[PDB]
Amino acid sequence: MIVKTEEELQALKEIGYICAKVRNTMQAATKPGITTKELDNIAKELFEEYGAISAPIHDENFPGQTCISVNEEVAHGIPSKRVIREGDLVNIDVSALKNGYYADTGISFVVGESDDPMKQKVCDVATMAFENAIAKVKPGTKLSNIGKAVHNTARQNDLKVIKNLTGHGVGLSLHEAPAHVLNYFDPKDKTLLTEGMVLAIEPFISSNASFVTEGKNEWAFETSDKSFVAQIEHTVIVTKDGPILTTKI
C-alpha cells in the first residue's frame, strides 16, 4: 500500500512491533529439544496478548500461526512435532494483521553450532544483502536496485540467490503491488519506489541452489540438493528521510 495518513503509519508501526516481538521471542526460545509446534505456540499466545491475528491463517488458511522452516526447508515450513537439534538452520517468518494493517518479517539463524560454517555464512550474507538493499531505498529509485544489490552481495561472497522467491508489497494484505521484489537485477523493469510505499524485502541467499521446488508437503519449499538457504525479511516504508522498518526494534 501507499501510506497517506499518520494513522496508517501508526497502525503499520504497531503491527510491525508485534511481529518483531514475536519473531525475537521465538528465536530466543529456539534450542535443541523444542519442537517447531512448541515454537509456534509462543506466537499464538503473543498474538492473543497483543490483539493481532496470524496472517498465514487469515490470508492463506496456513496450518500454523507462523512459518518455521528447518534445514532442507527454505520457506513455508509447517510447525509440527519436528524437534530442533544442535546445528539446525532455522527460518522463522512471522506475519500478522491488526486493525486491518499488516507486517511481515523473518530471520534465519543457526542453533548452537553446526559442523559446517556454511550455515552461518548464508545467514551472515543474507543479513548483509538486506542491509545493502535498503541502503538503496528512497522515493524515485528503481525497484530493481534492490535485486541488483542482493545479487551483487551474493556474488561478493561466492554464494547464490533463490531466483524464484521474491519480496512483495505489503500493508493492507500479505501481497500487493509491487507484485515481486526480485533477488536479482531485471534491466527491463522501470518500476520505481514512491513516498509511502510499503514493501516486504526478503532476500534469500543460497549455498548452491538458484531455485526452490515443492517440498515434503503442499506448503514447504525446499531444494533437492539440500542447499543451505537463509532469509532476512523486514517490512519497510519508503520515505523522503529514509526507510522505516516497522519490524525492527
Ligand SMILES: CCCC[C@H](N)C(O)(O)CNC1CC1
Ligand atoms: C503462508 C504465507 C507466508 C508468506 C511469507 N510471510 C512471505 O510473505 O514472506 C512470502 N514468502 C514466500 C517467499 C517465500
Ligand SMILES: [Co+2]
Ligand atoms: Co514473510
Ligand SMILES: [Co+2]
Ligand atoms: Co513476505
